Design a protein around this ligand. Structure first.
Ligand code: F15
Ligand code: CL
Length: 162
């Protein structure tokens, strides 16, 4: 457990809808550096289920193209923590959200020597929210991040932030 900030009292139904990946950071440069980097993902929409799982729509650059992806993050016993099903079991943690403006989340690999970690600042609108970005930078201050990206409003309105 690298990340030690989770949202108390998270109501997952209230994160439904449209989001923008305004800023991203990761523990290793290689996780975000190229357009095709493994955790360079651009959130489109969050769809919580009635049983409280979380369907994620996002874009990712794969094979010289911007591809649509649909991911399912299954709930755990902790409201703020979800598990993505993949070869390596990947936890999604919601750090902080106000539902109406911003949501901060991190994804971490369960076990790895110096396990990898990416975090995003999501916002509801294609605007630079300095307040959400300050909350994101404060949340990351002790995490061992080595790359950070952020996107301008023009980019946020383009597929894969071109
Ligand atoms: C509550 C906020 C949840 C947003 C979580 C987004 C998780 C994104 C995980 C994507 C991991 C890469 C998938 C693409 C691939 O399999 O190549
Ligand atoms: Cl659990």
């Amino acid at each position: 457990l690298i990340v030690t900030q989770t949202m108390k009292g998270l109501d997952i139904q209230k994160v439904a809808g449209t989001w923008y990946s305004l800023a991203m950071a990761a523990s290793d440069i290689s996780l975000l550096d190229a357009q095709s980097a493994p955790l360079r993902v651009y959130v489109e929409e969050l769809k919580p289920t009635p049983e409280g799982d979380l369907e994620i729509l996002l874009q990712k650059w794969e094979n010289g193209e911007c591809a649509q992806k649909k991911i399912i993050a299954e709930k755990t016993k902790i409201p703020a923590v979800f598990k993505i099903d993949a070869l390596n079991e990947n936890k999604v943690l919601v750090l902080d959200t106000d539902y109406k403006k911003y949501l901060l989340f991190c994804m971490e690999n369960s076990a790895e020597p110096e396990q990898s970690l990416a975090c995003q600042c999501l916002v509801r609108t294609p605007e630079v929210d300095d307040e959400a970005l300050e909350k994101f930078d404060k949340a990351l201050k002790a995490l061992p991040m080595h790359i950070r990206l952020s996107f301008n409003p023009t980019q946020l309105e383009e597929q894969c932030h071109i």
